[PDB]
Amino acid sequence: RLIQYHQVLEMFILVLQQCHKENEDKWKRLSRQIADIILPMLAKQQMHIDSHEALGVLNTLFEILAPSSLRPVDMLLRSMFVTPNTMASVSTVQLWISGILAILRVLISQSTEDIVLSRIQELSFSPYLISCTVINRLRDGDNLPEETFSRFLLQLVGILLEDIVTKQLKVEMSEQQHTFYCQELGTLLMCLIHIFKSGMFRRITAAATRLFRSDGCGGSFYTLDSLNLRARSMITTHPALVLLWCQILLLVNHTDYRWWAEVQQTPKKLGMCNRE
Amino acid sequence: TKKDRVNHCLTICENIVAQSVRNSPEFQKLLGIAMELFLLCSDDAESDVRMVADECLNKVIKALMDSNLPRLQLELYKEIKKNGAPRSLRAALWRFAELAHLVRPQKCRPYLVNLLPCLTRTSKRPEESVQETLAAAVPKIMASFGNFANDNEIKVLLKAFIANLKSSSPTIRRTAAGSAVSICQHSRRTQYFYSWLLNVLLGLLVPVEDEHSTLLILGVLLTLRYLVPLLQQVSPSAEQLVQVYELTLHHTQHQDHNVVTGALELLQQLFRTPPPELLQTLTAVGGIGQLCRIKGDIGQSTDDDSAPLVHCVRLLSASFLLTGGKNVLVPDRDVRVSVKALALSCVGAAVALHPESFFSKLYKVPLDTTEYPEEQYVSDILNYIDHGDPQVRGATAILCGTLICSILSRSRFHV
């Protein structure tokens, strides 16, 4: 009855560890009982996971649940591939992205590219779930499977970049909410670097490399140049996140000097430390 | 004659603390006659008898907090119930309020219903000194007993203090303004009671064109200024807070400098601690429309072309700081240095929310070119850094600090 609060997920970690040290078939049943409740709640933004403490406790619960309780990945996929009720507030966007980060971490640590992509092909998701059209509605109020998965993650990079560089630190968001936007973007770009650098996700890497060369498909999707405009505006405020974006550009072979000559300040007042 | 009343009050004090047995024999009689004697010694004609009696109440209270405290609070309540001479009532009321957090939960509902008749009856008291003790007492009593009230109790006590917002005494007005807000703050239903008090306080001024008394305007603007710090996180609405803002701007144009000062102080609180929906409204383009003379067109708060803080910074600058003549400064005979220092502090707070409002021309439509050869910017208010008054000069330095910080953060260092 209280499972939306991360202090109760700490108690489920305790309860699950104890049944895993006696009845292994109580551990499986309780793991199904918890997972069949939490995945619908992540899909509806009903979990209180808008902090690094709460997101870290939810990540830990997914390591402690019995692997069979998550094994047909369809309920993870049907919980991840969803829109929020709105994007007009900061809180709803953060509850939505936090729930995606939790499930993305399960897919890349407890499943495989073959299992995930073959289920994404069968379940009939599409790239257009969070097109710029959908995003623009929800900000006012209300295919190959690797192409769907890659486009979904790269649309989230756009949403986080637009919010980090356009919201204001007393009007629209608090310093704690601004901190968690940066911690979510940092977590997303580390997931993308793991996916591209590990060699375990070769079809998603090929698809993402093809997407970064694509146009916006009639303005359905963020162009690489629109993402780079936002990232260039962060050089003065968030150098650590911009260096993760530089690392992503190299993993997809974007070696265009129109980016690299700006960040490296290539030759054609004390200066700013974040630029250095 | 004189020393006898001193030695009597002191010898009963010594005996009360010396008794040591305290098993409720005759000591319950002795402590009663001691407490009533000290509350008479504390309104005696001779200053040394009063100065002694205060030590004897304080000594007996601290000597008996461990054991007989329920009786101390009851004997203090009896003197508040008498409604007697001013110092005898004060001497009971502040001590009762110090001891109020020590009441056990089972006795709070009893003490509250016994004190609603008292706090209302003593609000009707004309003495300025009884009112300064009441201003200190209500926050302390309500922080302990307010959860044991119900809405009909709270509204009776709010209406008793709201009736004093009309008073000629600034002290009676201050006691009423602080009491009403503390009564909301310590209620069960705080958000309901803030919105209810906003509806009464706006109810006293809404028509705006009507012949409202200067005294009532001063009492209501003061009550809003204590309330605003509590509204930043049924509850207060955006439009209900827009009314407070529009009203606050209107009273900056009153003929009485007391009303101008009270309006500028309310405006300073609004920009230092804005409620979220009000912040959104005042920084949004067309935000309100989506729901010592001015000398030209400065726009209106309702204009579609701009954010409301742009009109606000023009209105303050045109009313108090600038004449329309480039690099010339309003005389200190025309506008007081106190009103000037407040106007500079309001502009510095508006520029913290929306720094584009600093860069504006003072008028939307230019003045007569034959009288005014060149146009004036709001940024001429930096000339007050050379003004003779240290507070005006210091307020102008805080405007420089707030402008630099606001522009650097709004631009994300893309200056």
Swiss-Prot record, chain B:
| Expression by tissue | Expressed in the brain cortex (at protein level). Widely expressed with the highest level of expression in the brain (nerve fibers, varicosities, and nerve endings). In the brain, the regions where it can be mainly found are the cerebellar cortex, the neocortex, the striatum, and the hippocampal formation.
**HEAT repeats (start-end):** 110-147, 152-189
N6-acetyllysine: modified positions: 82, 140
Disease linkage? Huntington disease: A neurodegenerative disorder characterized by involuntary movements (chorea), general motor impairment, psychiatric disorders and dementia. Onset of the disease occurs usually in the third or fourth decade of life. Onset and clinical course depend on the degree of poly-Gln repeat expansion, longer expansions resulting in earlier onset and more severe clinical manifestations. Neuropathology of Huntington disease displays a distinctive pattern with loss of neurons, especially in the caudate and putamen. Lopes-Maciel-Rodan syndrome: An autosomal recessive neurodevelopmental disorder characterized by developmental regression in infancy, delayed psychomotor development, severe intellectual disability, and cerebral and cerebellar atrophy. Additional features include swallowing problems, dystonia, bradykinesia, and continuous manual stereotypies without chorea. Some patients manifest seizures.
Say which family it is in.
Belongs to the huntingtin family.
Domain remark text? The N-terminal Gln-rich and Pro-rich domain has great conformational flexibility and is likely to exist in a fluctuating equilibrium of alpha-helical, random coil, and extended conformations.
Q: What quaternary arrangement does the UniProt entry report? A: Interacts with PFN1. Interacts through its N-terminus with PRPF40A. Interacts with PQBP1. Interacts with SETD2. Interacts with SH3GLB1. Interacts with SYVN. Interacts with TPR; the interaction is inhibited by forms of Huntingtin with expanded polyglutamine stretch. Interacts with ZDHHC13 (via ANK repeats). Interacts with ZDHHC17 (via ANK repeats). Interacts with F8A1/F8A2/F8A3. Found in a complex with F8A1/F8A2/F8A3, HTT and RAB5A; mediates the recruitment of HTT by RAB5A.
Q: Give the protein's recorded name.
A: Huntingtin
Biological classification of the source:
Eukaryota, Metazoa, Chordata, Craniata, Vertebrata
**Source gene?**
HTT
